[PDB]
Amino acid sequence: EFKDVFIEKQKGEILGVVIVESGWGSILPTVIIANMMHGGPAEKSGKLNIGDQIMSINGTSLVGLPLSTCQSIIKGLKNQSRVKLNIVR
């Protein structure tokens, strides 16, 4: 279940999602929203719910890249105003 997650926030604010190197036995390993601000941008959209296997952010495929890359993407999503990240359900 692909999901065009759109996380809108104020410039200078991070999405609020914490994904980890998904290594379970399902889908293509990439990332796992292990955590997510209870009410933050991620929860605001009402789409991403801790445990979502994100696939890409604003056109940035998280597949094949380690956690360091993904984290940097989330951290760099502070002053975007919105996040077009397609996750996997």
UniProtKB/Swiss-Prot annotation:
Tissue: Brain and spinal cord. Isoform 2 is expressed in testis and brain, but not detected in lung, liver or spleen.
Residue ranges occupied by any PDZ domain in the UniProt entry: 4-89
Localization per Swiss-Prot or TrEMBL: Cytoplasm; Cytoplasm, Perinuclear region; Nucleus
Segments traversing the membrane: none
Function according to Swiss-Prot or TrEMBL: Putative function in synaptic vesicle exocytosis by binding to Munc18-1, an essential component of the synaptic vesicle exocytotic machinery. May modulate processing of the amyloid-beta precursor protein (APP) and hence formation of APP-beta. Component of the LIN-10-LIN-2-LIN-7 complex, which associates with the motor protein KIF17 to transport vesicles containing N-methyl-D-aspartate (NMDA) receptor subunit NR2B along microtubules.
Subunit structure: Part of a multimeric complex containing STXBP1 and STX1A. Interacts with STXBP1. Also part of the brain-specific heterotrimeric complex LIN-10/X11-alpha, LIN-2/CASK, and LIN7. Component of the brain-specific heterotrimeric complex (LIN-10-LIN-2-LIN-7 complex) composed of at least APBA1, CASK, and LIN7, which associates with the motor protein KIF17 to transport vesicles along microtubules. Within the complex, interacts (via PDZ domain) with the motor protein KIF17; the interaction is direct and is required for association of KIF17 with the cargo that is to be transported.
Domain remarks in the Swiss-Prot or TrEMBL record: Composed of an N-terminal domain that binds Munc18-1 and LIN-2/CASK, a middle phosphotyrosine-binding domain (PID/PTB) that mediates binding with the cytoplasmic domain of the amyloid-beta precursor protein, and two C-terminal PDZ domains thought to attach proteins to the plasma membrane.
Protein's name in the database: Amyloid-beta A4 precursor protein-binding family A member 1
Organism whose genome encodes this protein: Homo sapiens (Human)
Lineage: Eukaryota, Metazoa, Chordata, Craniata, Vertebrata
